[PDB]
Amino acid sequence: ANIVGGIEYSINNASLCSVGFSVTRGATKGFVTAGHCGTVNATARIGGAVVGTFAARVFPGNDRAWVSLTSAQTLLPRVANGSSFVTVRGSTEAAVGAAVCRSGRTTGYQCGTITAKNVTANYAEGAVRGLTQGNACAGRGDSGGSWITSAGQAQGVMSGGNVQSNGNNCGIPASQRSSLFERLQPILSQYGLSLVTG
């Protein structure tokens, strides 16, 4: 499978999440995603085929994971935006006020701005600290997906949000949205990963 940010993958033939970013760890191919999407050694499938397994995760506390892929997978420096693509150029962390977009398999590609950093989300499982908040909307299934600027700087992976009963926060105004992502830079250094760029 071609590994592009934003696309759907399944975890042990049950949950669905979205690919965050293509990364390498020496000769190993992988992608970063949300920690709550699977446990270590959970099997990830893309389009019904086994592509790799969860190698490590931290959730709750943090919300991060990376999936080690088989050598047959094709890593690409890209995040899906409809039928188009955004090229991953690096991982400069944008500041509050900056414009940002996110990609995932439920709401597709949504943009908004960064409103706050170091937010704690109190999930049923435990708190996850240090999240950045944007007001781009998101829905159930978007977890793990890419947050990127139009200039191609990768920001982090979708963690959670104030979802309404329709499964997303796209029908409430931007001013009222809290969509939270886990910062990419600590995930890259914690696991010794390098971003695939183009």
Partner: peptide, 4 residues
């Protein structure tokens, strides 16, 4: 806010 919930995970996703």
């Amino acid at each position: 806010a919930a995970p996703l």
